[PDB]
Amino acid sequence: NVSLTAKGGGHYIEDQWDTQVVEAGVFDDWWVHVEAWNKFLDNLRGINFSVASSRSQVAEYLAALDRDLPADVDRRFAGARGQIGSPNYLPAPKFFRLDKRTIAELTRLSRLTDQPHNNRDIELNRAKRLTLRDVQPLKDSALHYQYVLIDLQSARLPVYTRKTFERELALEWIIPD
Amino acid sequence: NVSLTAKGGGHYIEDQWDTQVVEAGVFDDWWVHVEAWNKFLDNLRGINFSVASSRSQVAEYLAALDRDLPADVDRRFAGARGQIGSPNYLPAPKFFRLDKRTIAELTRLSRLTDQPHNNRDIELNRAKRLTLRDVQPLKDSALHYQYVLIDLQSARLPVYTRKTFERELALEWIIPD
Amino acid sequence: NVSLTAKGGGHYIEDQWDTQVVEAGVFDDWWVHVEAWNKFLDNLRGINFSVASSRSQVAEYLAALDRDLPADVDRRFAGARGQIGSPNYLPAPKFFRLDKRTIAELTRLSRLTDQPHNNRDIELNRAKRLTLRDVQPLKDSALHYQYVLIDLQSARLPVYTRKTFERELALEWIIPD
Amino acid sequence: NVSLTAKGGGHYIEDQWDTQVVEAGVFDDWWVHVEAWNKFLDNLRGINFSVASSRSQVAEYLAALDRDLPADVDRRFAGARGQIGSPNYLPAPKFFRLDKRTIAELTRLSRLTDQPHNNRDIELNRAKRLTLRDVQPLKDSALHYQYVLIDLQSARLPVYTRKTFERELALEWIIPD
Amino acid sequence: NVSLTAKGGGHYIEDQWDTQVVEAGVFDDWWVHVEAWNKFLDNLRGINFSVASSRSQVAEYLAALDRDLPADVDRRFAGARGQIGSPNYLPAPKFFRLDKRTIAELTRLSRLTDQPHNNRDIELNRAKRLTLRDVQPLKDSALHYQYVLIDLQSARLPVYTRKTFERELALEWIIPD
Amino acid sequence: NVSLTAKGGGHYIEDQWDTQVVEAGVFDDWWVHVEAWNKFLDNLRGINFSVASSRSQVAEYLAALDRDLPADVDRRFAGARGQIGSPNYLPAPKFFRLDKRTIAELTRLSRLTDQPHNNRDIELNRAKRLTLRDVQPLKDSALHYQYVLIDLQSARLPVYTRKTFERELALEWIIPD
Amino acid sequence: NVSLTAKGGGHYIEDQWDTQVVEAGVFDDWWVHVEAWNKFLDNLRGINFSVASSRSQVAEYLAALDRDLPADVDRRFAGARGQIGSPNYLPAPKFFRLDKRTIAELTRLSRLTDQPHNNRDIELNRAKRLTLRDVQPLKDSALHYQYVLIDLQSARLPVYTRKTFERELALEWIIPD
Amino acid sequence: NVSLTAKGGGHYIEDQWDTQVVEAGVFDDWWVHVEAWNKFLDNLRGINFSVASSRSQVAEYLAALDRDLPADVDRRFAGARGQIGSPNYLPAPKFFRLDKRTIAELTRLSRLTDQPHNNRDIELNRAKRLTLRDVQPLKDSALHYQYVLIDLQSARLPVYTRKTFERELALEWIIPD
Amino acid sequence: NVSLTAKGGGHYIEDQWDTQVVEAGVFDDWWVHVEAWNKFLDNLRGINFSVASSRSQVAEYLAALDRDLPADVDRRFAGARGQIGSPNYLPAPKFFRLDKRTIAELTRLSRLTDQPHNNRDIELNRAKRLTLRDVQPLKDSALHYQYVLIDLQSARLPVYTRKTFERELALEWIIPD
Amino acid sequence: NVSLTAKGGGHYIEDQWDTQVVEAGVFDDWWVHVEAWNKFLDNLRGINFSVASSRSQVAEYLAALDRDLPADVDRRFAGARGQIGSPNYLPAPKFFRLDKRTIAELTRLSRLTDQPHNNRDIELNRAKRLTLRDVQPLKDSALHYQYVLIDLQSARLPVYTRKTFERELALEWIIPD
Amino acid sequence: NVSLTAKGGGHYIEDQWDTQVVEAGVFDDWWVHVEAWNKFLDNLRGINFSVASSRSQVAEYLAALDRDLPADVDRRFAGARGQIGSPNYLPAPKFFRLDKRTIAELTRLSRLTDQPHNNRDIELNRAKRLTLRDVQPLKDSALHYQYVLIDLQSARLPVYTRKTFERELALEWIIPD
């Protein structure tokens, strides 16, 4: 979970954090790492309808993606620590604000994926000794998938650095006394 | 159950607690931990219709989620104890007020899940020696599930800290004499 | 049965207890403990239609829930005994007044549950050597269940402490002479 | 991932990088190497509908293509280091700015490719001992493929060198003091 | 039987013991030792359906578990005797109040276990000289077991020390005159 | 059983231990050692369905895992005793708080494992002189195992040191007078 | 277990170790040696489905791989001790942070491997005196293996030296006074 | 393992090695010797599907191929030491950078090779005294092999000398003071 | 029989001995010496099913094990007499309280051992002049033995010294007047 | 029995020995000498199933292994007595704490070994004048042996010196006054 | 046993030996001499399945191989004593650290070797006056042998001199004062 920045130094004033960032309007609002989100993106490009265990994979990743908000005062929104120029830099984390509309779209995928099933035939028709099977209820889903996903990739979402997160919501870091 | 804060110190005046918080309007009203609720969220993302024991899992979690209200005078609404800055902080608990409408929605899921069944065929057609089975009564449910759940995730619910719970309902903590 | 408070000290005047609390209007009117009722609630969330012994469980709990009224003069409506502040408190019992309408709803569940049956087939078709079975008379019940229960959870019922039970019905405790 | 140029020397001023290149308008916007993209191109020319494992190949390459943006201050947009004339040159990298419209086209291919299937027949009709099979749902796809791809090759996309990337978006490299 | 504390010193007043603890509401209500109950727990985790003598073990333990209530005036509810700090302490006994509902659940296990049988075949088909046998009536039981037991472990039951048993039911110990 | 720290020195105040740690909310709640739990983990990775005596091994370990809570006043939550720097340190014990939900999951494994059986055939068909056998009722279990276990490993559980156990539940150690 | 670096010298401040590295976010998170992990990699390349004892080998290695985290204050994250240039160097250990998603993938392999079986036929059909056998339940697994493994090799995981482990999580080593 | 060049002389600056070559982007990225790789190539040209022990040969070589990266500061990327002209030269090592895509292709071969099997028939039908056998599941594999291999040979991969490895990633060798 | 400590000195008060130790709750409850019990343990490890006279050995030892309770007022629970330090010490006896459940387990062994028999054949088939014999009714017993015994060894039983036996049951020794 | 260190000097305080080492948690817990245990190890490597008298050897050694705990106050945990440097040293004893789980594993071997038998045939078929014999009930055991033993060798158990035994359980040696 | 180096001179500091080399992580970890191990290697190359006494030879050597760790302070890890150049040198001992995985592999061989048997036929069918015999249970073993051994030879294990053993684990030799 992306809370990789030291607790200490401190701190958000606690008049505004209460007011603006917690209580209403950030948290319980999702956050994924850039060049960590992309990876999420392709696990799903990227998937074969249909063999089982290749479908349960959609469900699996969304947990542990990993998804959190990094600054929890006493924390700074991750930066990250280097001087410009000298080669110990670690230049920034950039984070994605997914929106009230989309997490409920990512969700759509998670159970656009599996459908109630009659699989157990194998323990029947084939093994003690036909069926073939029906495919269609998959096919439409496999296509429904292609759209809900082609939206996901082609949907320019807001990026946020430490520089921005203090600007968009004004919070002061209050450096020691 | 989230009653993690010391009994002692005390106490809510007992003129208002009786009046406002107990008797009518909080209790018997649910409360789940943030970043503890989310986890609830994904156990359910997050589920395969249909194999048994993957359906009874919805029922199972809602008990022990865990769900309670933390301040019971003599108790303070959990805070939690640290000074800002110095790295022994434990910064806050933030709690979800689910609403008279939703607990009866979470409930919907719990028994949107299982349906009366003819499973015992296995002890018949297959084992002493076909059936296949019928799927449809599952399928619709599996889709009914996808909606009642896509509401759950995309439903911005009220968050409450110690700072807020004394403000929204005014109670005084009455520090020793 | 929630009669956990000492007999002794005494007592309700016996002019009003006769008049108001016994004779007509409380007793034979049900009472369940809070955070003891909830538990009742989830045993039933919380149940699989259909395997037997998972249905007889509804019937079983309603007896021993446990259900009684706590003050029987010479008794005080349970309080309970602690000073505020000092950590030997036991802060209150809060009790649910279920209503003439609902106990006859909880009842509905108890025998919404089982139905006359042809089970004994197992001792026939399957064991000396098919049937499958019919499910439908269960299915509707399983859904009838989901409603009579989704009312139960989402039905804000009156809570009562010692503070309230003497106020709503005025009784004096008559402390020794 | 094409970040082949030394971290060090530094650096983009950090007034404009924040403003123009990160935050909004480059990143999360794709970048493929020239004469590295072409190779991508022909893996797909270049493919046989239908044998399996010859279809999963579309999915596979798009990850690891490889795709990234090279300058992350403190980094210079790769150049690359040689003097003109003397035979240690490494003359330039030239990079493709694919567009909001196309990555969602490349995506189209990735799952224009596989479709829900009834393959498991082989473990049936043929192996324990006909079917033939149906082809048509492939055929149309195989043709749908030919168009979405004939666009890809015949779509002149913007090339960018170090010389250009500082011109199109004005950033200064700030050489030591 | 957990009556390990000296008879003597005395005594419960005998106005309340009669009233509250004996007569109605404790006794004939079960009591098992903590870290003595757990052991009970795992003898049953913890069992193989099916070989005989591995099933009669459920029956066997519940007697001698051991189960009793410790204070019988003239007795103190076991404490136990040490000063804090100095290393002859014996710090407390903590006891489980199992409930009217559960002892009738523990019972369920005891004869969920054995079933009427045709074992004597061995003295027939096999020894003077086939049968195999039927398993199914075991199998369901073995699964019925898994649930009635998974309730037992995951059922947080009330713990009681000397400190509590005098508080929950108010009794005075009456130290010599 | 992890009670490895000296009785003596003392002691938890006994106002809070009664209140918070015993009575309700820790005990009867499980505790396994880190890098002692892992070992538990792999005994189960780690197991062959099916040969007998390779299945009874699941049952066997869970007892003696070993599982207890270490501080029982008069005891300190194990630390452990060294100065920083000088090489007689023994740096800490870190302990796992498994949850009301999981011990009833670990339990699931214990009897997900064995099933009622017809083994005794060997003393028949084969030895006095076929059968083969049926495998399927194992196979599903072996797969059911793979999931209930893949949850166990991939379930980040709370770690607790002496530093934390006094913070999360506030108890004072009361050093001699 | 890779704890090869001297205890002594000391030490991590113990304000941050508690905060950041232990408690939550490293430990119970896996760590394998580079050019020690690779070896793990090929034991599994690298395996024949199916002869027994060539399948139990997957299970066997994952224990003792060997897997631990090296710095436990008072310990330094292994370095390792040499001056640059002079030929007694031992240049670094580089370690793999496997992720919450993957250890539950490595696990998948461990019991993707064995399946419930009817082997004992050999002691029957063949030895006292046919069967052949069925292969298919292996075959699919053998292919399922090929994918879960082709992910393992082609999954660029994070490498960490002493230089990095203090940077990514900021800890100070506190050299003697 | 190709680390044939003296440790000593030294050394890579350790500002860039950390930055560029280790940490992310070379290591855990494979390296095979030229005119040592070719040999690998033909062991596989070069193989008979199917006799056993002629298939396990694919698996065997990939370990010990041998595969490593040669410069580990304090090491120089192998050169190798001679003056031009005078006949003690040893002119260069040239190394292959296989890519994230291909090692997962070489892997494909390793277990494209063996399949779950019914071989043990020989100990049956033939030896105690038909079967013939089935070939097809081999045949397709033998052809699948021919393609995944005809890619391997006809895939021009990047060659790297000492001259290049310092140019492509800029590292300085820092000759004594 | 372990009554090795002088009669004399005296004595247990005879108000408590009657009350607590005799009458009900110690005696007729077994007691074996430590490092005298172990020896019992291995005589049984430790035994060959089956030759006669190697089976009657189980029966034989349990009598004379030897088993008794040592203090019979006027007796002190054996101590034993030495000063600390000076080398005439005899430091303690430590005794095992076997439980109502186990003596009936040790018993199980005693006649798990022999079974009704047809031995006398030897005086027939073999001596005046075949039979072989049947083994199976032994074999199962020999295995039944292995379990009832593997419980015995791995069952941590309570140890008791003089220091403890006066603490667990409070008795005073009453030294002369 | 490893009690090789002089009685005298003295002594463990007798407040802690009672508390911690005896009573509960060491004794009746096994202890074998290092480089004395190994020898045990190979007597069993190391054994031929099957000729009799080569099987009774497992049983025989476990008694007299030899197994005891060395310090019995008044005793010091054996050290052993030498000064460093001067060649009369006897440097340490190091001892193995086998665990509640393993002694019940070593036990397994002891009677994994012998099985009820029909040997006496020799006095029949062969000597007064065929049989051959049956082997299988041995064979499986011989293999069952190979596993329960391959655990024994590859199970890193805790080593303890005098230095450690006073640290892990804190006891003071109390040197004369 | 390779403890060939004088006791005397001394000594390992005894702060680190306790910490690092003994207690946990070397001892009970095996050690074989180079060009003494090889010899072990070929006794096993090197063996004929099957004649008896040519199989018991595997078992025999592993004891007395010989296997120990040479430095036991007060001892130096054997060196060995000569000056470079002058022809009384004895240049080094180099030792093999076999691993937790392999000693349990060498073990495999030891009882991969013998199997329960029916040999005694010779005293029957052949000598008083056919059988032939069955070979197969040997044959597979003889092949199982060939693999577990072809791993042993082709498994590059770590070599250690005095120079290395003080470097890998840092211990100081402390030369007289």
GROMACS .gro file of N, CA and C in nm, chain H residues 72-122:
model
  153
 1311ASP      N    1   3.115  -0.728  -1.223
 1311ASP     CA    2   3.056  -0.691  -1.096
 1311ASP      C    3   3.158  -0.608  -1.019
 1312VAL      N    4   3.142  -0.476  -1.019
 1312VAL     CA    5   3.247  -0.395  -0.961
 1312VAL      C    6   3.262  -0.450  -0.822
 1313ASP      N    7   3.387  -0.473  -0.782
 1313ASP     CA    8   3.505  -0.431  -0.857
 1313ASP      C    9   3.549  -0.525  -0.970
 1314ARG      N   10   3.485  -0.513  -1.085
 1314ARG     CA   11   3.526  -0.590  -1.202
 1314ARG      C   12   3.514  -0.508  -1.330
 1315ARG      N   13   3.600  -0.536  -1.427
 1315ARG     CA   14   3.585  -0.477  -1.560
 1315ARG      C   15   3.506  -0.572  -1.650
 1316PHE      N   16   3.418  -0.518  -1.734
 1316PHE     CA   17   3.350  -0.601  -1.832
 1316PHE      C   18   3.453  -0.665  -1.923
 1317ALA      N   19   3.453  -0.798  -1.930
 1317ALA     CA   20   3.566  -0.872  -1.983
 1317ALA      C   21   3.602  -0.824  -2.122
 1318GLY      N   22   3.732  -0.815  -2.151
 1318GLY     CA   23   3.783  -0.739  -2.264
 1318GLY      C   24   3.816  -0.794  -2.403
 1319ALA      N   25   3.920  -0.876  -2.423
 1319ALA     CA   26   4.012  -0.929  -2.322
 1319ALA      C   27   4.161  -0.905  -2.358
 1320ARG      N   28   4.246  -0.922  -2.257
 1320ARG     CA   29   4.384  -0.874  -2.247
 1320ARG      C   30   4.475  -0.933  -2.356
 1321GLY      N   31   4.508  -0.846  -2.449
 1321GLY     CA   32   4.618  -0.863  -2.541
 1321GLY      C   33   4.647  -0.727  -2.598
 1322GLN      N   34   4.768  -0.709  -2.647
 1322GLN     CA   35   4.798  -0.601  -2.743
 1322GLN      C   36   4.759  -0.645  -2.884
 1323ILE      N   37   4.717  -0.550  -2.966
 1323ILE     CA   38   4.693  -0.578  -3.107
 1323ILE      C   39   4.827  -0.618  -3.170
 1324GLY      N   40   4.823  -0.710  -3.266
 1324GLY     CA   41   4.943  -0.749  -3.337
 1324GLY      C   42   5.021  -0.867  -3.281
 1325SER      N   43   5.074  -0.852  -3.160
 1325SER     CA   44   5.163  -0.953  -3.103
 1325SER      C   45   5.088  -1.075  -3.049
 1326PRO      N   46   5.132  -1.194  -3.090
 1326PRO     CA   47   5.048  -1.312  -3.078
 1326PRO      C   48   5.046  -1.366  -2.936
 1327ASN      N   49   4.993  -1.280  -2.849
 1327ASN     CA   50   4.924  -1.318  -2.726
 1327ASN      C   51   4.808  -1.221  -2.706
 1328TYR      N   52   4.699  -1.246  -2.778
 1328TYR     CA   53   4.589  -1.149  -2.789
 1328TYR      C   54   4.454  -1.175  -2.717
 1329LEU      N   55   4.393  -1.292  -2.736
 1329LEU     CA   56   4.260  -1.315  -2.674
 1329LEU      C   57   4.156  -1.203  -2.699
 1330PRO      N   58   4.118  -1.182  -2.826
 1330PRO     CA   59   4.071  -1.051  -2.877
 1330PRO      C   60   3.944  -0.982  -2.820
 1331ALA      N   61   3.834  -1.053  -2.805
 1331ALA     CA   62   3.723  -1.003  -2.725
 1331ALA      C   63   3.628  -1.113  -2.682
 1332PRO      N   64   3.552  -1.088  -2.576
 1332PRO     CA   65   3.423  -1.155  -2.559
 1332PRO      C   66   3.308  -1.068  -2.609
 1333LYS      N   67   3.214  -1.130  -2.680
 1333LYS     CA   68   3.096  -1.060  -2.729
 1333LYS      C   69   2.974  -1.131  -2.674
 1334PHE      N   70   2.884  -1.056  -2.611
 1334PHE     CA   71   2.776  -1.115  -2.532
 1334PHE      C   72   2.635  -1.078  -2.579
 1335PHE      N   73   2.541  -1.171  -2.560
 1335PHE     CA   74   2.405  -1.153  -2.611
 1335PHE      C   75   2.309  -1.103  -2.505
 1336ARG      N   76   2.248  -0.987  -2.529
 1336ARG     CA   77   2.141  -0.943  -2.442
 1336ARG      C   78   2.009  -1.002  -2.492
 1337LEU      N   79   1.971  -1.117  -2.438
 1337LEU     CA   80   1.839  -1.175  -2.462
 1337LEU      C   81   1.736  -1.084  -2.394
 1338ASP      N   82   1.608  -1.082  -2.434
 1338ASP     CA   83   1.513  -0.974  -2.387
 1338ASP      C   84   1.389  -1.019  -2.304
 1339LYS      N   85   1.320  -0.929  -2.238
 1339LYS     CA   86   1.224  -0.970  -2.137
 1339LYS      C   87   1.132  -1.067  -2.208
 1340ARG      N   88   1.106  -1.041  -2.335
 1340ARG     CA   89   1.020  -1.130  -2.418
 1340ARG      C   90   1.066  -1.278  -2.449
 1341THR      N   91   1.194  -1.291  -2.488
 1341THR     CA   92   1.265  -1.419  -2.513
 1341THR      C   93   1.306  -1.522  -2.403
 1342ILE      N   94   1.367  -1.480  -2.291
 1342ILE     CA   95   1.388  -1.574  -2.181
 1342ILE      C   96   1.259  -1.646  -2.145
 1343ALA      N   97   1.147  -1.579  -2.169
 1343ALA     CA   98   1.016  -1.638  -2.146
 1343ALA      C   99   0.972  -1.715  -2.270
 1344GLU      N  100   1.059  -1.715  -2.371
 1344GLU     CA  101   1.042  -1.796  -2.491
 1344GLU      C  102   1.131  -1.920  -2.483
 1345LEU      N  103   1.255  -1.900  -2.439
 1345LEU     CA  104   1.346  -2.012  -2.413
 1345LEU      C  105   1.281  -2.104  -2.311
 1346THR      N  106   1.219  -2.042  -2.210
 1346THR     CA  107   1.141  -2.114  -2.110
 1346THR      C  108   1.033  -2.200  -2.174
 1347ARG      N  109   0.961  -2.141  -2.270
 1347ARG     CA  110   0.854  -2.209  -2.341
 1347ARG      C  111   0.901  -2.345  -2.391
 1348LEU      N  112   1.017  -2.345  -2.456
 1348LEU     CA  113   1.080  -2.468  -2.505
 1348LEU      C  114   1.099  -2.571  -2.394
 1349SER      N  115   1.156  -2.526  -2.283
 1349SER     CA  116   1.191  -2.614  -2.171
 1349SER      C  117   1.074  -2.702  -2.127
 1350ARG      N  118   0.953  -2.648  -2.128
 1350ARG     CA  119   0.836  -2.729  -2.095
 1350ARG      C  120   0.732  -2.730  -2.206
 1351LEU      N  121   0.773  -2.694  -2.327
 1351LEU     CA  122   0.701  -2.733  -2.448
 1351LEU      C  123   0.737  -2.879  -2.469
 1352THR      N  124   0.849  -2.916  -2.407
 1352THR     CA  125   0.914  -3.043  -2.429
 1352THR      C  126   0.845  -3.164  -2.364
 1353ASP      N  127   0.830  -3.167  -2.231
 1353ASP     CA  128   0.771  -3.286  -2.167
 1353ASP      C  129   0.621  -3.266  -2.136
 1354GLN      N  130   0.553  -3.380  -2.141
 1354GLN     CA  131   0.411  -3.389  -2.117
 1354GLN      C  132   0.385  -3.515  -2.036
 1355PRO      N  133   0.283  -3.504  -1.953
 1355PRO     CA  134   0.230  -3.610  -1.869
 1355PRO      C  135   0.183  -3.720  -1.960
 1356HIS      N  136   0.210  -3.838  -1.908
 1356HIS     CA  137   0.253  -3.958  -1.979
 1356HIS      C  138   0.193  -4.085  -1.917
 1357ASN      N  139   0.195  -4.195  -1.993
 1357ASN     CA  140   0.142  -4.323  -1.946
 1357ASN      C  141   0.243  -4.436  -1.968
 1358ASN      N  142   0.369  -4.396  -1.985
 1358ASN     CA  143   0.483  -4.483  -2.013
 1358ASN      C  144   0.485  -4.619  -1.946
 1359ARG      N  145   0.444  -4.622  -1.820
 1359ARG     CA  146   0.460  -4.739  -1.734
 1359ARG      C  147   0.393  -4.863  -1.793
 1360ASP      N  148   0.331  -4.846  -1.908
 1360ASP     CA  149   0.266  -4.958  -1.971
 1360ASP      C  150   0.371  -5.067  -1.992
 1361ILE      N  151   0.495  -5.028  -2.017
 1361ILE     CA  152   0.596  -5.125  -2.058
 1361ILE      C  153   0.609  -5.229  -1.948
   0.00000   0.00000   0.00000
